[PDB]
């Protein structure tokens, strides 16, 4: 029963990632043969760098990748939904229903599920500050410490509004646009708008001018013998330094005094650069070098011989500030475009990475909320409501597809059960309470794991975007279906 | 019993590929030692990159290759028919019939099978749009999602009609003639007629002219020291750039400004090509480079010294459009011939490959329908009708060949049984229903796996080209025959 | 698959007993741990004293016992028919038909098969001597040597007619009524009507009167110390002989002079019996003693004290004839009832037992023919005719019971296939020839294994009573059905 | 119970470093495959260069490093407190 084997592998991954769904998501420990350990709770990492020899499991990598690509959030919801869906699918196969009937029933159930989620979702304008803060806090949830939730949410909404590039309504609040720097210790209160890309490298030379207002900023990427007579070696050294003088002189004619180079340096090179007072940062990555080129306005010039004054950028300020322990060049004043890197502070490296993922997911969610402008109650409320309407549809329909639709309803209902279980509440009792509440006509009663009770989600500020839940359902459906559609494992010829 | 061993291997492959026959064919997962996984359901792939140590099984590779070469559709049908034929052959040798008598009976059976398939087939004009759409949907069936069936069928017929090169009645609608590009995400609605081969490569230089109306397009394939004195190296560099200047100058005298090169480039090379505004795409394969040469009209010039203005092609437009995520040069306006590559969009990589195979099979089927102009009802209806007339022939013939012909009829009837089994219906009951229906005189009652019932195929739009089924029967017979003709495995001297 | 296991066991027994069906039945060799060996070919013995650990096979003991009880002929036919029925049942479960549908189909098949056999059977009067001889030869076939077939058939019909006790039409030709004796060597020409039960024991005393015309025959069953003074032993002996004297005196007053006693004797006892000239045979079994009591007319007297002249029987003659090697008392002249034992001569012990079984089967078959007065052509002709009419019924009936009906027809045709295989002819060719013949309207064309061809059975004298075939089909049906009706093996509590 | 395993590893480390808390802290010895030996009682060193395959224990490396970075004193107090906290 290779299908049973694949279902078992998907079940194993689903139960593995089940425990990390919610504000109290019990984190997970990723250990590799090299011995490096990173503690994370966001499901994207746990699906990213885990070992999977089972190839049916290996498809869930692709499922999570697609989820992250379109939405960027809800991967753990998608995987848990897929787990519950394959639970009930296996349940229907031992009863006797053919798999294709299960697939057809799940397809119909999910079409009506997206339709139901469209109806139930409450709309939001982009000016109701409390609602945006609630969405930001709900997405922020899971990873950040309980203390700094209000602070990071406030900074998130502040950055989103202040850097709101009104590109015809759709604000281009990209992940690489908001300005943070990474550093151990201190706190999260350094997530401020510093108008420029800050590099985590020290100045090469002490007497290099640390302060340069309205500096002529340049961006470069190029890396900055046969002897016969006794003085021939000195002659070669003379002509290399002469041509070096020539290139840096035609650079100075353009006026460049601040440079960030993609490659390494040499002691003599940095010495003669600082002779004229030229900044040079080395080993600058491709992505961050491109970001710096966009921000500073100095186009990357591989062939530096054609550099002109028109090719140079400008920055309002460049400064070396001894913030914290490490030394950095706090570049500030890149006035062309809002461009930045996802580098954020915390106390210890695990917390640094956790807060990095948290802020990334936070901007993702508020961006989705602003774009789509539809928010659905979270905390399992949307799942229970869609399950109830799916059961109404089951009452409407008849046949052995009704069993499949009921299976889909139960699998969708599984998510609030997990969210309650990670909260410490008993799953069956609180889930029955949720069902009974939703049978009274109200729609926003969910589970709040911060308070550890069942309450109105709208008053508790627990709301997730509609689109993230739509894609969670869609990806879970596509995972369950394409894992069901397999029959047997066969050895495939390796491409030579 | 080495014959029994070969039969067992053929049965193993037949049962492996049986499950992937029909609209609801449960897909198969091809896993290799490298760990790459591709989900496929078209039997051609499953027979192509599977490991087969058994040589009797290895012959079915050649059978499938022949099937794809002549027909291009029906490898799964051919292999399942061969499996069923060897099923009943194994029975008949169990009874006591000598193998040569089984071969004789099978040969006569398939002669009359091709004859009756010729008579039963309903003819089609190339102007009955609904019939062509039905054929395209039936062949399209199997691999695409249920949502985009009508869409992709519409684009298939639209491309076939619009690119109908009337070459004396036989329209040259080749697989490499219709214009699609491959890209992750988006949808299948980009399968439009873009009159030119679009390359999935970015421009080398930003300031390279993205827009060039009526551009002079060229096609190239060539790849674009002892020091004594201090300046000998500089003189060598000077003469290399001088001859580079010379060859590109006599190129510019021809007027070429758009180039697609077969080999790599260098940073200085792309810099000095973009100095004059010359497009250059690298690492273009042999096949797609030949396609570009055919489309653009610029003959491939290995010895570029003989390039002349007469040798240059022309294109109405070349444009870089940021469609989706990947940056590509959307070349459009190649006015000489309709030429393109089989590269098609979808959501994820597995789905991308699935719809690529689907669209390829779709054009193959409509091409076969337009060429032959004879369509047979699908859904197993043709199989049942041919089996019924074969049983009439059995009633005519007396002797021990009658048992072989009845064996052929049962093996042929196995296809509708498989098609019902993959649909979820019980095989024996629906098979008996099909036989009873065909005994009433009507000919089009089959199995529709979308609706999951038995219905008239002609009103359900489930119809296959007659040539595809003819070649399926013929290839299955030649597989079963020449697998039966073997006696024993012996070690053969390896060629030194 | 314990049902598959039971089917396999029944298959093994069916194939074991298949080879002994017909005139040319390859005999079977029964060897036991004691080392005694008996060569037999009647399937009755083969099913009786074979070892079977498998319980499902152990049921076939009961099937064969029932067959012998009702019919007395056709155990091998029943077992082979059960084997072929389970052949086709196993294939039908392979296709997917539920077992209960097969049971229902077989029930309907066998109701109609009994009806068909009733119609096809040709009637016979009890005075057509050639027809009775043909029936006797057909039944006697299988076991008797080819030389003495005509002879033993002639004696069979002669004994049946001469000992025809007209009990209201139903002649009581019992197996224990016709007079034969067993003795090694000689020949079968001693199967003559000797009017009396003849006991394989020598006279106890030489001077015992061997010849006694109109002898007063008696039948008995009873078996024919403290010392103080020297002569007390002698007085005890005197009174024992005195009481012996008075009991044999009151016997002599009745007049008995011939006795056949159930128990042993003593030297003095036989001496004083022969003093007056009294015959005494010892160790006569229960069955043969009861037979002698019936034949001689002397009721068995446990308490001999009440024996009277009225209680004595009479016999026309008693004689000791030194026929062959062993010495014997050829008792002849028991005038009350025809009573005898199944003891028959041949050359060797194996041939003795073979001839005994063959003659018993011959009287059984001729008795059945006289009783029922309906005879069907044998040699597989009846099976093929019933199969053809069953196929006509299948053409009448529509549904999945038609498949079961066809299964029953093929399982019924398997009998002529076996009968041809044991005859040396090729099975498929002669089966096809038989089917073609029966399709031309004639109904008596069968297989004659003596001539080794296919010919009309009625002119070949190959005809077997209809009731035997009816019971064969019925027993095979019950066997196949109740073997199919089992699910799995469970350990049963042993009764304490 | 992988949580029980992690708690057991943390307990083992806590009990190991428990004995070196105070003026009369019984010192510990650090022996490596090279054979070099250093006698130390400050828990910083003890948590510094000890072999720990268990990764849950390997987090206590980072805990001690944070402690030394901010405070510079109290690594043994922190680890013993963590041990007692995980006890209860
Ligand atoms: N404050 C909250 N209280 C209770 N449940 C919450 C809260 N915030 C979010 N959730 C639940 O957590 C789910 C998202 O979990 P999360 O782990 O953040 O997703 P992902 O792992 O994909 O980032 C939401 O669908 C919602 O039901
Ligand atoms: N719409 C349909 N409904 C039911 N059966 C279909 C339908 N379309 C095709 N089929 C069946 O599937 C067969 C072709 O299966 P397919 O897997 O496409 O072949 P291949 O694997 O060789 O491409 C046809 O011969 C037909 O009997
Ligand atoms: N002379 C014959 N020639 C050919 N077949 C015969 C002949 N006599 C009997 N048979 C076949 O043998 C069958 C009976 O076989 P037999 O072994 O005698 O049964 P059993 O073992 O029960 O006594 C009959 O049904 C008939 O078809
Ligand atoms: N003179 C003392 N008498 C008793 N206890 C002491 C004394 N000095 C320090 N302590 C205890 O030892 C603790 C610090 O132990 P120590 O091993 O020095 O810490 P660390 O190993 O981090 O340097 C203090 O919290 C205190 O309770
Ligand atoms: Mg989330
Ligand atoms: Mg096909
Ligand atoms: Mg018999
Ligand atoms: Mg201290």
Numbering used by the authors:
A (entry chain G), B (entry chain H), C (entry chain J): 19 to 242, 253 to 524
D (entry chain F): 19 to 106
Sentences from the paper on this structure:
ACII formed a heterogeneous mixture of eight-subunit oligomers, including both single and double rings, even without ATP. ACII was purified as a mixture of monomers and oligomers, and the presence of ATP triggered the typical conformational changes in chaperonins, transitioning between open and closed states. The 2D and 3D analysis of the particles revealed both single- and double-ring structures in both open and closed configurations. When comparing this structure with modern chaperonins such as E. coli GroEL (Group I) or the group II eukaryotic chaperonin CCT, we found that ACII possesses a built-in helical lid protrusion, similar to CCT. This feature allows ACII to close its cavity without needing a separate co-chaperonin like GroES, which GroEL requires. In ACII, a similar salt bridge exists between H299 and E334. Altogether, these observations suggest that while ACII possesses a built-in lid that reduces reliance on a GroES-type cochaperonin for cavity closure, the resulting closure is less complete than that of CCT subunits, where total sealing prevents solute entry or exit.
All chaperonin monomers share a common three-domain structure: an apical domain involved in substrate recognition, an equatorial domain containing the ATP-binding site that drives the conformational changes that occur during the chaperonin functional cycle, and an intermediate domain linking the two by relaying signals. Using ancestral sequence reconstruction (ASR) and protein resurrection, we inferred and experimentally characterized the last common ancestors of these groups (ancestral chaperonins ACI, ACII, and ACIII).
